[model samples]
Target: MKLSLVISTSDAAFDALAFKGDLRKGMELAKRVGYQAVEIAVRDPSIVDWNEVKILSEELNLPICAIGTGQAYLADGLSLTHPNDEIRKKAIERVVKHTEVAGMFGALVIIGLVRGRREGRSYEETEELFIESMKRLLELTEHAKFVIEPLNRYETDFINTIDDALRILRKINSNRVGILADTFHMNIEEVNIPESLKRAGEKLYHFHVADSNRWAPGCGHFDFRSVFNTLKEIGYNRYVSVECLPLPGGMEEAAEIAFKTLKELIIKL
Candidate 1:
């Protein structure tokens, strides 16, 4: 796999999902720190400076491996499973925008907390709404990998495990869709992380890495070696994007430690 850091359009956007920065500077940091690629989290595609993104990406030679859409839910409270019809429609449109932006970078469009929760609705009701929203999104875009990210239960009430996400992929029955596994969430939900990934198999489209404590690797006790081994065994070669909270020192430390720690383990594999 490849090493990538998560960046956001605004410096103060979502620290939980990225290393935090102004768009251009973050990409530069990833390049200077020696990460192979970077993932950008955008709240809305139209509002971002695409020209700058194109310039920075080309000039720095930093590949944008993924486009994160969870900020749609985090900032605007828009979700695919929302009970309100307008909000759900807005959420679908937001992801469609992500898929379009992803085409330029050949990036996977990620759906994380944006899938929302059951709210006051029934479990079956919310799942159907979520599925329909995904179907609508699929109809609106093509040639972009729309990934379902399995967040921890504390973050969302639906699709909290790899199997839960796989069920959606089976229901949707599309090669254009797949799973983006976040190690931090998997630690909480999976019985055995590596085994669960093996179950995901080829449907795994992207990977997110963070320690048990939601900090960079080596700060918390999550087995990086076994995870890398499982990834290699499955012939999965994709971006291992660092999705973690900046701790012990904030953005710089977290990104550097994650890059170095995970790099050693990945290269050893």
Candidate 2:
């Protein structure tokens, strides 16, 4: 599997989910540290010049693995399942822009926390809104991979398992749309990670890797070897991105360990 890391455009939040302060620096670091790609998390597509991003990524030889949409929710409170129609429309428009940019960069657009919450509505009502929005988004994102992520329950009440993600994917019934499973979430939600990965199989489009403590792969109790083996068994050849917090060591240290550990494990596979 190919290795990648998360990098964001903003520097305001401590948990910004990005590495370098600027795109240039981030790309340089990702290349220097031996990452095959960089996943970009952008809050607003309006402020970014897609040409610049594309040129820089091409120049650095660091392809963008994915476009993260969580910042749009975290920073701007945009969610596809929001009760307000206008708010939901804005959210859909934001992701539509992301999908367009991702298509240009040959990257996938991630639907994470942006799926939103249940609020006072029942799960069915919330899922209906979420499904409708996703259907609309998928119609326009035909050129790019549109992936729905299964976040942990603490993060969102919707799509917290591979089964839940598949339910939506089956409904959408599009090859361009798929599931992005996080080992961090799988550790919490799945009875067994390997079995869950096998179940996802070809439907698993993108992947996120972190240990039980949400640190680098080896920093916690999770068995990444088994996880890696299972991924190989399922014929998963996509990017496995490091989306964990900097802990036990700093960001640099954690990233290094993640790369080193996963690299060694991948070689064995």
Candidate 3:
């Protein structure tokens, strides 16, 4: 499996989780620390110059693993499952642009907290909006792959488990859509992380690696051995991107240590 780290091009609320501010510095640090790719978290696709990003990516030889969409919701309050249809329309347009831009880099688009929660609407009501929006978004992209991240309960009331993600995938029944399993969320929701990995299997197109406390992988208790073993067992040759807090050490220090540890683990697998 290849290793990746989350890096944001702009300062947003999610900046505290991983690399943020400058994409160039993030790419440099990723390469210097032995990462194969970097997952970029952008609030708006228009704010990023895809041509410049492509040039830098090609120069550094570090591909973008995925484009994160949670920031759109964080920065602009856009939600595919919003109560208002116009707000949902705006959210869909943002994702459509993201899908087109991400396709240029051959990267997946992440559908995270942008799915919104059931504030006052019923579960069925929210899901109907979400599903309808997703169908429209999927129809717009020909080469882009969209992955839904099952956040923990505290993050959102919708799709908080692997089962939740799978249910939606089955309903959509599209090969272009997949699941993004985060170790941090699985720690709280899955009965067993390794078993859940096996269950996700090929539907798992992308992954996020973070310890139980949302810190870098070795800073907290997590059975990564079994985790990697399951990935090997299922033949998941995709990117296991790091999406953790730069804690116990700074961002650079934590990222270097996590890369070294995960590299050793990957080699053993």
Candidate 4:
């Protein structure tokens, strides 16, 4: 299990302009606190210059295992399951573009938040649309695989469980799409986290490392023993990126504390 950092948070605005400096800051903090890699959310393509990202990765010698496609959560214009099929197709195209970029850098895509449900549609209707879009994306990246995460109810209206996520994957029948088991949402929706990991098995591709209180790993009441033990039990070989708000302070303070705490808790695994 490796600790990866999710660069931007609710507390700070980190785009490409701030990326060089922020990444330098993040790398120094990560090394001091103990982290193997980091995850960056690519917002505007112009904002996140891939060349700079590549250069920084070389300079810091940190592996970027994955990039989060969760920015659609904040986008008012796009949704993969939008009511309009044309808009939904456009959304699929948008996400596929990101996947191509991620593949160029040898990273997996974390597809979360861009999937949508209609204002008052039946579950079947929404499922059909979501499946359609996912299949399209699978075709677009025939040789590459991406990970999809289940957000909490507040962030998304559907696909909130391992079963729900697996059902969608099975329906699409695409080897290119994998599951990202996020602890924060699981803490809210699932009954047994360890047991769920066992059920997911190899289909699980990535993990959002977070603690019980929804801050960082060490400062909360999460059962790290069981979680890490299960990861070993299930042989979940993937990136474990910290995906939470930098609590109570700026990215420097909060992320530093979170990173240190992660090192301590992860060692117990």
Task: Highest TM-score: give the candidate number.
Answer: 3
Off by over 4 Å in 3: 11-21
- Cα misplacement distance, residue 198 of candidate 1 (Å): 0.5
Q: Give the better candidate number (2 or 3) by TM-score.
A: 3
Predicted candidate 4, C-alpha RMSD: 2.7
Off by over 4 Å in 1: 11-21
The 10-residue segment with the lowest total lDDT in model 1: 11-20
Looking at model 3, residue 197 earns an lDDT score of: 79
Off by over 4 Å in 4: 9-16, 248-250, 264-269
Better of 3 and 4 by TM-score: 3
**What would you estimate as the lDDT of candidate 4?**
0.74
Using lDDT, rank the candidates from best to worst. Answer: 3, 1, 2, 4
Write down the TM-score of every candidate.
0.93, 0.93, 0.94, 0.89
Model 3: how far is 177 from its true place, Å? Answer: 0.5
lDDT per residue (tens digit) for residues 1-269 in model 3: 88999864655334532323378888998999989999987777765557877898999999998999997898789999988888989999999888878888899999999888898878888888888888898787778899999999899999988888888988888999999999999999999888887878889999999888988899899888899999999999999898888876888987887887788889996
Angstrom error of the Cα, residue 159, model 3: value is 0.4
Error of 4 at 56 (Å): 0.9
TM-score, candidate 2, is 0.93
Residue-wise lDDT of candidate 2 within 97-125, one digit each (tens)? 88888878888999899989898789889
